[PDB]
Amino acid sequence: DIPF
Amino acid sequence: DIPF
Amino acid sequence: NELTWHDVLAEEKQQPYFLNTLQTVASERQSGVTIYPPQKDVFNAFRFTELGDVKVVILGQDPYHGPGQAHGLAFSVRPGIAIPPSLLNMYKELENTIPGFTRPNHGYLESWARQGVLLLNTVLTVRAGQAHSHASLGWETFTDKVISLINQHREGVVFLLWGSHAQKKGAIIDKQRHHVLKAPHPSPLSAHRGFFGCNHFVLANQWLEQRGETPIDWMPVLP
Known about the structure:
Chain C: Excises uracil residues from the DNA which can arise as a result of misincorporation of dUMP residues by DNA polymerase or due to deamination of cytosine. Chain C: It catalyses: Hydrolyzes single-stranded DNA or mismatched double-stranded DNA and polynucleotides, releasing free uracil. The complex is a heterotrimer, with two copies of chain A and one copy of chain C. Chain A is low in regular secondary structure. Chain A has no helix or strand. Chain A is elongated, with a radius of gyration of 4 Å. By secondary structure, chain C is of the alpha/beta class. Chain C has a single domain (about 1-223), classed as Uracil-DNA Glycosylase, subunit E (3-Layer(aba) Sandwich). Chain C is built from eight helices and six strands; from the N terminus they run ααβαβααββαβαβα. Chain C has helices at about 5-10, 15-30, 45-50, 85-95, 110-115, 140-155, 165-170, 200-210, and strands at about 35, 55-60, 115-120, 125, 160, 180-185. Chain C has a four-stranded parallel β-sheet. In chain C, strands 1-4 form a two-stranded antiparallel sheet. The two termini of chain C are about 25 Å apart. Chains in contact: A-C, B-C. The interface of A and C includes residues 1, 2 and 4 of A.
């Protein structure tokens, strides 16, 4: 769920 | 005090 | 820029304050504490507005703290949710200043984010009903770093800093390299002290056009  |  | 968040936050993801924040939030969810927004939405500002695409940054403080409201963007609410009073005041300023803007029938602002408006709360989670309940975690450290990275790695971003908290958060920004505009918060608690009349949405677009870039269409669109 973390876009990085 | 303004959270939103 | 071609720059992405992944290019500049990969090491930040490994920092203790960041790991401790995620672990604390996860432990609270596990223990049965209702926390907003849902885990899948916490980083939606970053998903919808990549680093190289940032044109305008608008800071908030906390996520909305009621069921179904917050979805990982400052100011915005999910479709179907009543318009928050601060967003209603933003809509009133918009209708008074942007030619052809008319009152939207929803408060969902993904379409702003997809145009390069980074809608960044400085704290990214909250316990249900309880403003500032996650302020003591490391989210402000994280969002300090995010603002510092935009300052460092981009040129010519417009920062709209509304209220004392946001203005302090933006005190670092280079005011020659970027365009910083300040006003009171759009909340009913402060909007009549100078948010109405600030003309920030027009001013942001005038800057973008002077830079040779496309302006923001501030009318939000439902998906």
